[PDB]
Nucleic acid binder design. Structure first.
Ligand SMILES: [K+]
Ligand SMILES: [K+]
Ligand SMILES: [K+]
Ligand SMILES: [K+]
Ligand SMILES: [K+]
Ligand SMILES: [K+]
Ligand SMILES: [K+]
Ligand SMILES: [K+]
Ligand SMILES: [K+]
Ligand SMILES: [K+]
Ligand SMILES: [K+]
Ligand SMILES: [K+]
Ligand SMILES: [K+]
Ligand SMILES: [K+]
Ligand SMILES: [K+]
Ligand SMILES: [K+]
Ligand SMILES: [K+]
Ligand SMILES: [K+]
Ligand SMILES: [K+]
Ligand SMILES: [K+]
Ligand SMILES: [K+]
Ligand SMILES: [K+]
Ligand SMILES: [K+]
Ligand SMILES: [K+]
Ligand SMILES: [K+]
Ligand SMILES: [K+]
Ligand SMILES: [Mg+2]
Ligand SMILES: [Mg+2]
Ligand SMILES: [Mg+2]
Ligand SMILES: [Mg+2]
Ligand SMILES: [Mg+2]
Ligand SMILES: [Mg+2]
Ligand SMILES: [Mg+2]
Ligand SMILES: [Mg+2]
Ligand SMILES: [Mg+2]
Ligand SMILES: [Mg+2]
Ligand SMILES: [Mg+2]
Ligand SMILES: [Mg+2]
Ligand SMILES: [Mg+2]
Ligand SMILES: [Mg+2]
Ligand SMILES: [Mg+2]
Ligand SMILES: [Mg+2]
Lengths: 148, 56, 314, 178, 30
RNA sequence: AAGGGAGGCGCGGCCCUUCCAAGGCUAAAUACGCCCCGGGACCGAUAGCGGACCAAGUAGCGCGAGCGAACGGUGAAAAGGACGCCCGGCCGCUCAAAAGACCUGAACCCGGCCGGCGCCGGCCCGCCGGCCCCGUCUCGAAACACGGACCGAGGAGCCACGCGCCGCGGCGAGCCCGAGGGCCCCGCGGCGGAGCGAGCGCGAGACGCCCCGGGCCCGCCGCGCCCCUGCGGGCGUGC
C-alpha cells in the first residue's frame, strides 16, 4: 500500500533522502555487474571468491535422470514401516519371520549409515550400500540384499 | 586543479567515539601457531585420562 | 448442547446437536487478512492508452532562444512532458500490475470457520449491526422446506423475529455521495439476514427482499459472512442446511478443524483463584517524597532534622 | 548547559511486549507479566521474556531432544515456549510431561500413546504459575541456514561460504590463488 | 559491504516495439 | 556414393541399440486489430483518444514529404422580454428567480461613495524597541553569483521482475489456490530432507538449556600396519 511507505514522508524536503552535495543522478557506477576487476575489486574479493576464471571438466549435454541418485540413512528405515505394525515386529525379534523393506519402492537407491537401528532383525533390499550401513545392519542380525 | 593530500585531524575523535574495543576473550587461548608436537601430546594425554576422556 | 429448531410459524419443534465448527477460536486478525486478499481478486484492470501524449511530433529548441528546454511542437507549443498540457504521464498506469493475491488453503478454511463461529454469539451479532432483540435463538434454525411466493417468505421472517432487520434494510436505500453514482453504483442499501439452504427451494421467495442473500451450504462465501470485513452476520439456517454442517466438514480431505482455546474471560478467572493467589507476597513500603523547603524558616521545620536545638533556628 | 556525554552511553531498545496480532499470545503474556509483579520469581521473569520473542529466536524442539535432555529427571515438567515437533528416527518414546505453545498433530499422538501429557501454558498458569518442579528449555538459536552466511567469505579467517554460484578459481583454491 | 547473490535475470526485449511479448491471463476464467 | 542415417568431443577398427532422407495431403487443442455486444474500486472538459461542441484528421500552415488546433452547461416551460414616457435611455412586464445570452462566478488588476497614513512585541493605537531577499551550488551569499512582474489551474520515486535481510500468519520432516478438471471441491513437478570431490566417486553421532570454544566423525591430499572376493576390504596416523 502506497499510504504506509517511507517515500511519502519526504513531501516538502527538496530531495528525497539523496543529499544536497551528491544528489540523485542516473548511473554513477555503471550498469549491472561491470567493474568487478577494476573499481569494484574491493567488493568482489571480499564477498565473491571464485567468481572469475575456469575450473574443471565440461560436459556438452548432461543426462539429468542418469546422474539422479536418491539416498536414505538407516535411522530413517523403520519409519517406512506403518505404525500399526512396528510394535509387533519389535515384540517378536524373529529370524524366521523378519520384516522385509525394499527401499526402491519408496524411491531410494543407496543406503547410508548415519544413526542406529533398534535391536530387531530386519531385511533391507537396495541397489547399493555404504560400508558402515552394512556393518551396523549385520550388528543387529539383519541382512543386506541387492534387487533389480 | 589541486585538492588536499592528507590529514589526520578528526581521526582520533572518531577512533574514540565507540570506546576502544578489546579483542575476544577466546583469542588469548587460540591454539593457532603453537607447536604441533605439543598439541599432539596434549590430545593424547587427555584421551587416556578417565576423568577427562570423552570416548564412548 | 443442542440448538433449537422452529417451525415456519414460531413454536419449538425439534433439537439438533451443535456442529463442531462453532468451537473454533475467534480470530479477527485472520478474518481481516483473508477478506483483504480475496476482495482484491474480483478487480477489473484499468490503464491509460499506450499512445497517449506521444502521437504528436515535438523536439527541443535548445538554448539560445530565451525559452525553457522542453520539447515543442512546430510553432513552439509545449509538449511531451508530464508538466505540459497534453503530455504523457510521468509513469503511465499499466495492466501488468499484480491484481490478485494468494492465500493458502489452510488459512482460507480457518477464515470461514472463524467467521461461522462468530455468528453463534448474540453479543457479536448485535455489535455487528443487526437487530436481534426479538429473536428466539441466535443460532437460529428454522424448518421451512419449500418457499416460492415472497408473501409467504415474508411471513416466516416475521413469525420468528427477524422482521425489524429487513425493514432496517428496506428503509435505508439512498443515492451515494460521490462520483460513484456515474459509474453504475448509484444506490446503497444496508445488509440484513443470510439464509443458508441445502435441499429445499427457497431462493425464489427470499431473493427479492431488500438486504437478503442466499448460500447453498456446500459452498459458503467469506465475503458474505463478514460484510465490510466484520465477522458477525445474522444467519437463518434451514433445517437441512444446519444438519449437514458436519458432513460438509467431513468431505474436506485430510483436514481437521483448529484447536479450541480459552478466552480473556477464562484467564481473568484463574488469577482470582486460590492456587494463584496463594503465591502472592507484598512489596516493600514505598519511599516517601516531600518538597524541599528551608528548615531555618521556623522552629517546627528545623526541629524535624535536629530535635535538641543546639543549632540556631536563624 | 549540562555535560551529559562523557562517561555515559546510548540507551538500549529491547522487546518489552509481543508484536503478534494473535489474541492468545497477548492474553498469556499479559497474565504472566502480572504473576511476576506479585511474586518476584525469576522463573516467571524469564518466561515472560520468552513470550515476546520473534519466532526466529524461538526455534522448535523435537521429542528426541526432549527425551535426551529430560533423562534421569523424568518426573519433571519440561516447559517450552515454542512448537514441539516429532522425530520419526526415534522408534520408541519415553513417558514424559511437556508444556508447550503448540504441538504437531503427530507429536501429540505419540506423546499421549506413551502415557505422557501435553499441557498448555494456561494449564501451567493455573497449576504451577511460579515454576515449581519445572525446567525451562529451548532449541538451537543458530540452526538457521541464513545465519550460516553471515560475514566475509574471501577474507582469510572467515570459514563462511559465499551466496550465489561461483564457477571460477580465482581466490577459491586457498591462499596464493588470487 | 553489500553481500547479495547476483541476479540471473535477462534484460527485457521488445518492450515498446516489435512483436508483443507480454501474455496476460485475464481470459483464464473464460 | 550404395544399402544407408543417428546415438551433444575428433580420427581408425569391432560390436550393440534404434530409425529409412533426397516426393505429397491432413481436423482439433493455439493467436489476433478494424466492427458489433456486455462489464469496470478507471478519466470527468488544461483530465480522458489529437477529436464529448448539427459540419476533427476539420479550420489553419508548408513547393512538397508532412504538421495540426481552440471551442461542453439559460429555464420545469422560450413563456426570448408587455404598457407608457422622452429622443438609445428610463419605467416596468414574463418568471420561483433574470437565470436576459445566459449555472455557480474565486484570484491578479481596476472605477465610484465612506474611513485611515511592511512583519514581530508591549500598550487601544501611534509612539518606543527588534528585523537585509527568498530558493540554490558552496569553506563562505544581503551580495556587483544565478532563477524569480503578478495571479489561477496542471506539475516530478509509481508499476513489473530478480536478489538480500527483517517482521507477522498457517502448517511442520515436511510443505505447496501449477497448468488443468468438477470466494467451494480435486490437483505433478518443485524446494527442504547430506555433504564433499575436477572427476572415477565415496558418505556423517560423542559430548552440549542457549551462545562461544574444545574434542571427535564424513569428503578431498598424503602416508604405518594386517587381510578375504584384491591398485579391492579392514584398522590407524598428519596439515
Ligand atoms: K537515503
Ligand atoms: K557523497
Ligand atoms: K554514468
Ligand atoms: K553507465
Ligand atoms: K565484472
Ligand atoms: K583450462
Ligand atoms: K511521435
Ligand atoms: K529549461
Ligand atoms: K534551463
Ligand atoms: K495450505
Ligand atoms: K475462504
Ligand atoms: K557472497
Ligand atoms: K557416443
Ligand atoms: K550434436
Ligand atoms: K558427437
Ligand atoms: K487537445
Ligand atoms: K545553483
Ligand atoms: K555549479
Ligand atoms: K568552494
Ligand atoms: K541567500
Ligand atoms: K559583493
Ligand atoms: K542589490
Ligand atoms: K555561489
Ligand atoms: K554572471
Ligand atoms: K538574482
Ligand atoms: K579431487
Ligand atoms: Mg532534514
Ligand atoms: Mg522548494
Ligand atoms: Mg552520490
Ligand atoms: Mg563531490
Ligand atoms: Mg542536486
Ligand atoms: Mg571505537
Ligand atoms: Mg524547448
Ligand atoms: Mg493528456
Ligand atoms: Mg466532493
Ligand atoms: Mg503441409
Ligand atoms: Mg482535450
Ligand atoms: Mg453568470
Ligand atoms: Mg557542481
Ligand atoms: Mg550556473
Ligand atoms: Mg530575471
Ligand atoms: Mg496547483
Amino acid at each position: 500500500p502506497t499510504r504506509i511507505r517511507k517515500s511519502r514522508k519526504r513531501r516538502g524536503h527538496r530531495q528525497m533522502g539523496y543529499g544536497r552535495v551528491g544528489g540523485h543522478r542516473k548511473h554513477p557506477s555503471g550498469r549491472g555487474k561491470a567493474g568487478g576487476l577494476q573499481h569494484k575489486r574491493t567488493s568482489f574479493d571480499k564477498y565473491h571468491p571464485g567468481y572469475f576464471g575456469k575450473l574443471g571438466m565440461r560436459n556438452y549435454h548432461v543426462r539429468r535422470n542418469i546422474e539422479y541418485n536418491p539416498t536414505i540413512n538407516i535411522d530413517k528405515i523403520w519409519s517406512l514401516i506403518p505404525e500399526e505394525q512396528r510394535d509387533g515386529f519389535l515384540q517378536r525379534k524373529s529370524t524366521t519371520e523378519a520384516p522385509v523393506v525394499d527401499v526402491t519402492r519408496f524411491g531410494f537407491f543407496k543406503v547410508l549409515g548415519r544413526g542406529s537401528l533398534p535391536q530387531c532383525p530386519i531385511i533391507i533390499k537396495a541397489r547399493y550400500f555404504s560400508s558402515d550401513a552394512e556393518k551396523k545392519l549385520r550388528e543387529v542380525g539383519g541382512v543386506p540384499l541387492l534387487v533389480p | 586543479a589541486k585538492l588536499k593530500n592528507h590529514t589526520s585531524k578528526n581521526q582520533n575523535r572518531k577512533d574514540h567515539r565507540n570506546g576502544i574495543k578489546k579483542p575476544k576473550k577466546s583469542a588469548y587461548t587460540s591454539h593457532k601457531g603453537m607447536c604441533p608436537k605439543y598439541l599432539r601430546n596434549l590430545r593424547r594425554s587427555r584421551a587416556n585420562d578417565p576423568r577427562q576422556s570423552l570416548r564412548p | 448442547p443442542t440448538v433449537k429448531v422452529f417451525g415456519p410459524t414460531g413454536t419449538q419443534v425439534a433439537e439438533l446437536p451443535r456442529p463442531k465448527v462453532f468451537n473454533v477460536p475467534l480470530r479477527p486478525d485472520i478474518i481481516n487478512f483473508v477478506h483483504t486478499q480475496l476482495r482484491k481478486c474480483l478487480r477489473t484492470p484499468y490503464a491509460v492508452s499506450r499512445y497517449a501524449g506521444v502521437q504528436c511530433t515535438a523536439h527541443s529548441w535548445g538554448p539560445g532562444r530565451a525559452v525553457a528546454r522542453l520539447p515543442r511542437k512546430h510553432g513552439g507549443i509545449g509538449a511531451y512532458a508530464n508538466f505540459a498540457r497534453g503530455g504523457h504521464m510521468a509513469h503511465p498506469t499499466t495492466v501488468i500490475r499484480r491484481w490478485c493475491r494468494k492465500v493458502n488453503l489452510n488459512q482460507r478454511r480457518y477464515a470461514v470457520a472463524s467467521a461461522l463461529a462468530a455468528s453463534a454469539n448474540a453479543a457479536l451479532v448485535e455489535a455487528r449491526g443487526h437487530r436481534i432483540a426479538d429473536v428466539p435463538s441466535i443460532p437460529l434454525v428454522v424448518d421451512t422446506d419449500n418457499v416460492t411466493k415472497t408473501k409467504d417468505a415474508l411471513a416466516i421472517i416475521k413469525a420468528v423475529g427477524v422482521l425489524r432487520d429487513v425493514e432496517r434494510c428496506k428503509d435505508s436505500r439512498h443515492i451515494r455521495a460521490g462520483r460513484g453514482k456515474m459509474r453504475n453504483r448509484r444506490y446503497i442499501t444496508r445488509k440484513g439476514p443470510l439464509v443458508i439452504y441445502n435441499t429445499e427451494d427457497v431462493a425464489r421467495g427470499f431473493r427479492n427482499l431488500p438486504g437478503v442473500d442466499l448460500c447453498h451450504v456446500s459452498s459458503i462465501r467469506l465475503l458474505e459472512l463478514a460484510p465490510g470485513s466484520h465477522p458477525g452476520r445474522l444467519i437463518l439456517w434451514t433445517k437441512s442446511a444446519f444438519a449437514s454442517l458436519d458432513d460438509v466438514y467431513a468431505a474436506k480431505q485430510n483436514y481437521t478443524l483448529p484447536r479450541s482455546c480459552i478466552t480473556q474471560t477464562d484467564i481473568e478467572r484463574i488469577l482470582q483463584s486460590d492456587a494463584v493467589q496463594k503465591t502472592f507476597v507484598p512489596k516493600r513500603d514505598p519511599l516517601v517524597i516531600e518538597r524541599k523547603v528551608d528548615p531555618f524558616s521556623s522552629k517546627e521545620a528545623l526541629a524535624r532534622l535536629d530535635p535538641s536545638g543546639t543549632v540556631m533556628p536563624k | 548547559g549540562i555535560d551529559l556525554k562523557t562517561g555515559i552511553k546510548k540507551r538500549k531498545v529491547e522487546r518489552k511486549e509481543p508484536k503478534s496480532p494473535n489474541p492468545y499470545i497477548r492474553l498469556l503474556h499479559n497474565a504472566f507479566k502480572v504473576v511476576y509483579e506479585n511474586t518476584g520469581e525469576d522463573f516467571t521473569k524469564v518466561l515472560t521474556k520468552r513470550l515476546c520473542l520473534s519466532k526466529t529466536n524461538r526455534p522448535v524442539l523435537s521429542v528426541s531432544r526432549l527425551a535426551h535432555l529430560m533423562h534421569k529427571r523424568e518426573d519433571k515438567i519440561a516447559v517450552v515456549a515454542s512448537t514441539v515437533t516429532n522425530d520419526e528416527r526415534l522408534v520408541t518414546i519415553p513417558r514424559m510431561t511437556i508444556c508447550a505453545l503448540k504441538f504437531s498433530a503427530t507429536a501429540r499422538s505419540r506423546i499421549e500413546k506413551a502415557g505422557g501429557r501435553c499441557m498448555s501454558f494456561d494449564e501451567l498458569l493455573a497449576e504451577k504459575p511460579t515454576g515449581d518442579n519445572c525446567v525451562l528449555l529451548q532449541g538451537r538459536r543458530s540452526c538457521r541456514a541464513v545465519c550460516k552466511k553471515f560475514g566475509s567469505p574471501g577474507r582469510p579467517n572467515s570459514h563462511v561460504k559465499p551466496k550465489g554460484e561461483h564457477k571460477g578459481r580465482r581466490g577459491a583454491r586457498g591462499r596464493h590463488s588470487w | 559491504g553489500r553481500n547479495v547473490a547476483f541476479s540471473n535475470m535477462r534484460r527485457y526485449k521488445c518492450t515498446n516495439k516489435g512483436p508483443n511479448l507480454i501474455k496476460n491471463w485475464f481470459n483464464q476464467p473464460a
